[PDB]
């Protein structure tokens, strides 16, 4: 049996405040006895701006019922800073939240605020937590976003060593080994190899990157992630397509495709034809480019008939 807070001696001094819905509201939720009671007392606590242990206790009770309650999380963080609570303990509590499947974006934002405030000299333990969190859920968009923020924030403080960057690339390569179609891991690779301020972008560095990309294409020729990365890479560094063309050409009819091609690889690969088309435009061969665009439109990628026709008309 639930004991109402209006009967508890710990809360005797507090007068609860009802939700101010106005008359006959639309989309009302049939709040449970527990949730309504807790919110009634939170309304009172927050209105008087009480910073206390019982207030902290109450916010945990509410977020456990509704992890997506952004207002209550805001108040919780204020309570943590006012009461000068252990932020390390709070982090461990967030770990317990994930184990108990109490997950939502607000939990992840809370983690960011905690780590920003703790501001540890070495964020490795949190990096590890994120990796472990990504293993059974490898495409969690905001976990990936958080990982980007963490390395980015802590790097501006000069707290990410070269060894740390190296093991991060090691970890990324393993994620891509496990699932070459994990576009989130391709994105992380782009941060690690191209976009981050400290990325090694010497001439031989670019060469090695091309080798990795092409090896990925030869492994999985229909991998849209791999093609997008290739196109994005060449564009960003303003590199000509023609020199790489021999590696791509077999997919239209430096590491080369395996002979024979892997089983279950019907030709042509649509994005391989896009490459050929764009390499013709590079050579100012607009007619030959229009011809492959037309082929994509009417034969080899008909779902995008209108788009490839548009690209064809852009030449003729």
């Amino acid at each position: 049996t639930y004991i109402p807070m209006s009967q508890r001696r710990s809360w005797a001094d507090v007068k609860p405040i009802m939700q101010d819905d106005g008359p006959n509201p639309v989309v009302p939720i049939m709040y449970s006895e527990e949730y309504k009671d807790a919110m009634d007392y939170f309304r009172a606590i927050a209105a008087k701006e009480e910073k206390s242990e019982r207030a902290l206790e109450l916010t945990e009770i509410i977020v456990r019922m509704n992890p997506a309650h952004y207002t209550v999380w805001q108040y919780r963080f204020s309570l943590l800073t006012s009461l000068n609570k252990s932020l390390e303990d709070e982090l461990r509590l967030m770990n317990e939240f994930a184990v108990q499947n109490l997950k939502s974006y607000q939990v992840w934002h809370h983690r960011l605020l905690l780590l920003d405030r703790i501001s540890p000299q070495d964020p490795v333990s949190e990096i590890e937590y994120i990796h472990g969190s990504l293993l059974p859920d490898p495409k969690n968009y905001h976990t990936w976003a958080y990982l980007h923020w963490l390395y980015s924030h802590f790097s501006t403080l000069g707290r990410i060593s070269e060894a740390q960057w190296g093991s991060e690339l090691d970890w990324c390569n393993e994620m891509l080994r496990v699932d070459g179609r994990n576009n989130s891991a391709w994105g992380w690779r782009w941060y690690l190899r191209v976009s981050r301020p400290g990325a090694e972008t010497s001439s031989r560095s670019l060469q090695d990157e091309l080798i990795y990309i092409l090896k990925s294409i030869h492994l999985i020729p229909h991998n849209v992630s791999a093609w997008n990365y290739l196109r994005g890479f060449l564009k960003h560094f303003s590199l000509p397509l023609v020199p790489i063309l021999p590696a791509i050409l077999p997919y239209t009819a430096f590491p080369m495709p395996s002979d024979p091609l892997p089983e279950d690889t019907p030709l042509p690969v649509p994005l391989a034809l896009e490459y050929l088309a764009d390499s013709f435009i590079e050579q100012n061969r607009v007619d030959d480019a229009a011809k492959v665009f037309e082929k994509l439109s009417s034969e080899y990628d008909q779902m995008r008939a209108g788009y490839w026709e548009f690209r064809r008309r852009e030449c003729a």
Binding site: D20, M303, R304, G306
Partner: protein, 485 residues
Amino acid sequence: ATEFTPSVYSLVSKPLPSNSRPSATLDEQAETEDLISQLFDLTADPNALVSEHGKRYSGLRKQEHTQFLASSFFQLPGKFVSLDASRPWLVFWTVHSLDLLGVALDQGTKDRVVSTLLHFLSPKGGFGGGPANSQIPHLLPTYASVCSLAIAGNDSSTGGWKDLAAARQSIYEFFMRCKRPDGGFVVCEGGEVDVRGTYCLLVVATLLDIITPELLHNVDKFVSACQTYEGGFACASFPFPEPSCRVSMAEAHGGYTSCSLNSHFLLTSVPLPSFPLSIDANAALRWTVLQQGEPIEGGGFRGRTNKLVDGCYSWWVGGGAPVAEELVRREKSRKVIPPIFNRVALQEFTLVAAQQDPGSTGGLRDKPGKRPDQYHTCNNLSGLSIAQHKMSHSPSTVSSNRLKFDASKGLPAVKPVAPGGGWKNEDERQNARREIWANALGWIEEEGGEIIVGGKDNRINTTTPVFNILGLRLKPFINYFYCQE
């Protein structure tokens, strides 16, 4: 008109090739390919005259979807407490869905919608996900509330628009409190920075005539730095220390690509110098079109590369298509017509795959095997609207709008937070007011551009790109706040 938009039924459905490397992605993809294609096989081709015997009819089940929305409109079970911070969205998804379905609310029910939403308005500025005495203001429910008031409200004393007009200064101040120096906004106090917040803020600020130079500083750079190597946009960008460079923080994603493209589009009507910083429009269009699924997955959209198609991306990705197309058109004109995505196949996804099975709860869904909900109902219908109609931003209409604009009419100007944060003078403010208003009302329905797959009984109303409310809602609403009635 359908020459470059083939039907799923006229194309060959084959699985995404494995290349003899199995992975977790392909396992999920193949299973989804099976779900969608088998449903298409059970369902009569919407384009057929001879709707063959025994097969499921794909007609838009408007009454079933109306019932679905009605059943949760006046009461929700206690298990839906997870949506307590999102009740304004429940309102928006419903009232907008009903608008698209062409089902009117009586005045009494509309008045309840207005009352409910106004109690979410806090005196300090902005709407929260619940009553002001229960929740703090937040950019997203502010968008949902404002748009809902455009849909269900009016210009009388009980209409709610009056209250928004009076709230203009406080909402603007809330917006300014949300602002970060890099051009991003926090969604709420102590909250996350992302491009959805920007979108929601820019929509509201545009509609209510509260745009200032100080509000917009760096906002273009934040959005523009969200664009990834893939061509779509991430949720946010990171400023490395004014900033020496900005870096995208995640994958190109249907939702944030929509919000970014729309944000950028809204910024292009503000006549500030060297503003907004350009985006790569061609790459955004490329990414957009590439997210439309293969025939076997029903021609629906996915939200990111190598992920499953989802009904909701019909709005996020599909609704971004006309915006990307217009930006590409403008860039080509700055140097110096067939559909750009498969309009037919997208409607086919909606009718065949995204509807709840007939004779049940109704509503629209992510994909077969998923419970329908208000969110997917609204976003499926919004996307279907974009596919059904040919919406264009018309330079001649913008010109007509300029010629009819009355600068002597308007609401009091917002007082800026910083003394020099406003416009240089009254002339420049009025020119900005004109441009913002004229461009907001620039979207037209192209004559002869209509394609209604399965016949005219499937037709729903035309939604406006960028804003995602009906033109007939947008026009009198913005005209009220700019006093152009």
